[PDB]
Amino acid sequence: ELPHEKDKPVAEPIPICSFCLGTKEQNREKKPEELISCADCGNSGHPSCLKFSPELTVRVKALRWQCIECKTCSSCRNADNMLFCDSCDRGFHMECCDPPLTRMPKGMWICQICRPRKKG
Ligand SMILES: [Zn+2]
Ligand SMILES: [Zn+2]
Ligand SMILES: [Zn+2]
Ligand SMILES: [Zn+2]
C-alpha cells in the first residue's frame, strides 16, 4: 500500500450493488456474495458484477479501493486515457507509467507496485 492510502477517511459503504441492485445476499444469480465498496464515495459492486476474478477480489478487499468515478492516478494524485492494473485495479495515466506508455496494451498490464521493474 502507498503511504497516502494508509491514512485517510473511509466513506460508509452503500449495501447495494450499483449494477444489479442486490444486497450481499443476492448477486445476479440470486446467491449470496459480499460486496466490494469504494472508500471514497461508498458505491458498491458484487465482485462478479465487476467481472473481477477471485484473486483480484482478494487483493482489492485488502486495499483502499476507489470506484471508477473516484479513481485517482497513484503516481500524480479520470478521463478515458487511464490504465487500470489487472493486479490491483489502481489507476495510472499512461504518461505517469514507468516507463511511460503511448498505446493501449493488447493483453495484460501490471503496475510497478505489483511488479517492480527488474533493477539489475
Ligand atoms: Zn451485483
Ligand atoms: Zn467512489
Ligand atoms: Zn497493480
Ligand atoms: Zn497520472
Numbering used by the authors: 193 to 269, 274 to 316
Task: Show the paper's wording.
To understand the molecular basis of H3 recognition by MOZ and the consequences of H3K9 and H3K14 acetylation, we determined crystal structures spanning MOZ DPF (194–323) alone and in complex with a series of histone H3 peptides (1–21), unmodified or acetylated at H3K9 or H3K14 to 3.0 Å, 1.6 Å, 1.6 Å and 2.5 Å resolutions, respectively. In our structures, residues L194–D199 at the N-terminal boundary of PHD1 form a helix (denoted as α1) that folds back onto the DPF core and interacts with the PHD2 subdomain through salt bridge interactions between E197 and R286, hydrophobic contacts engaging L194 and I309 and interactions between the H196 and R269 side chains. Other interactions between the PHD1 and PHD2 subdomains are observed, including a hydrogen bond between W257 and D285. On H3 binding, subtle conformational changes in the DPF domain occur in regions of direct contact with H3, including a side chain rotation of F280 and changes in a linker region (designated L1), which harbours a helical turn in the H3 complex (A275-N277; labelled as α3a in Figure 2B) but not in the unbound DPF structure. The side chain of H3K4 inserts into a pocket on the surface of MOZ DPF that is partially occluded by residues from the L1 linker in the unbound DPF crystal structure.
The developmental regulator monocytic leukaemia zinc finger protein (MOZ) also known as (MYST3/KAT6A) is a MYST (Moz, Ybf, Sas, TIP60) family acetyltransferase that is required for self-renewal and differentiation of haematopoietic stem cells. In addition to the MOZ acetyltransferase domain (referred to as the MYST domain), the N-terminus of MOZ contains two tandem PHD fingers comprising the double PHD finger (DPF) domain. The structure of MOZ DPF shows the typical globular domain of a DPF with PHD1 and PHD2 each harbouring two zinc atoms coordinated by C4-H-C3 motifs in cross-brace topology. The structures combined with biochemical studies reveal how MOZ DPF manipulates the structure of the H3 tail to sample its modification status and promote its acetylation.
